[PDB]
Amino acid sequence: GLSPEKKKMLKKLIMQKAAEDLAN
Amino acid sequence: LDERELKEAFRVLDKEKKGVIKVDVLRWILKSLGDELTEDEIENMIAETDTDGSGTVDYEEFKCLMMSSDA
Ligand SMILES: [Ca+2]
């Protein structure tokens, strides 16, 4: 299992990367 | 999470257009954008995502992570 802090961070970072990469 | 957004994220992170996200991409994300994560915590977050240990995250695994509600 993942703590909710870590799971939330994981989801956040994945989306940040997708947004960043879309941008170039 | 809107499934449209989820599908767009998956497409962006599938670098080889093979229908999966390689675990290296996740490792990269956690190592570079993460805040002082240990290597074991990074490996744990990877394992939490890639649940079959295939070294690739398929769309079902991706959806499970991203759309899960634990409340
Ligand atoms: Ca997998």
Name residues 1-24 of chain A within 8 A of B (Cβ). Answer: 1-2, 4, 6-7, 9-11, 13-18, 21-22
- The experimental method is X-ray
Cα dihedral: B71, B54, B60, B33 (round 10): 60
Distance between CA atoms of residues A22 and A8, nearest Å? 21
Please tell me if residue B51 touches chain A, with a CB cutoff of 8 Å: no
How many whole angstroms from its chain centre is CA A13? 2
- Contacts of residue B58, defined as CB under 8 A and 6 or more positions apart, other chains included, come to B19, B20
Distance between CA atoms of residues B27 and B29, nearest Å? 5
Does residue B22 sit in helix, strand or coil? strand
Distance A21 CA to ligand 1 centre (A): 22
In chain A, what is the straight-line distance between the N-terminal and C-terminal CA atoms, in Å? 34
DSSP class of residue A24 equals -
- The total number of structural domains in chain B stands at 1
Q: In CATH, what number is assigned to the domain containing residue B46?
A: 1.10.238.10
**Resolution as reported, in Å:** 1.8
Residue A20 identity: E
**Tokens found for residue A16:** 């940040």
Domain that holds residue B55: 1-71
